[PDB]
Description:
PX Domain, three-stranded antiparallel sheet, globular, 3 strands, alpha+beta, protein transport, monomer
Amino acid sequence: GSSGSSGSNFLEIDIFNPQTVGVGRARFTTYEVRMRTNLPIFKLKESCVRRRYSDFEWLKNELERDSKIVVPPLPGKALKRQLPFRGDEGIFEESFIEERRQGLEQFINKIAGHPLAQNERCLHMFLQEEAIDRNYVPGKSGPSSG
Length: 146
């Protein structure tokens, strides 16, 4: 085959395929982060990787380092625990998953739009790359100098 289709640049990410991990309680789920762009900045045109909300919290933060970068808020709220023992107070409903599933998608959908982010590597690493490598080695990093 050959194929060949294009027209107008478009950078968007999809969040679906909610898979549950672990067993017992305070369990969590993931989402298939499938991005699709036609920009050069991105080495790959399309890639599918697995990621969760808690993960995004690592990425987002990575953006909230220092670079006049405007990162959007994460969909969720929780802060009332002295010691790391408790988590979710029994929550199992499509709505919830949807909320986050959609939320993130939106957050990234906008985050991706960000130019300062489009250059960021962590972003890509959080996309193309399936497994993040905390304290990775920077190289190439899109069109450097300029």
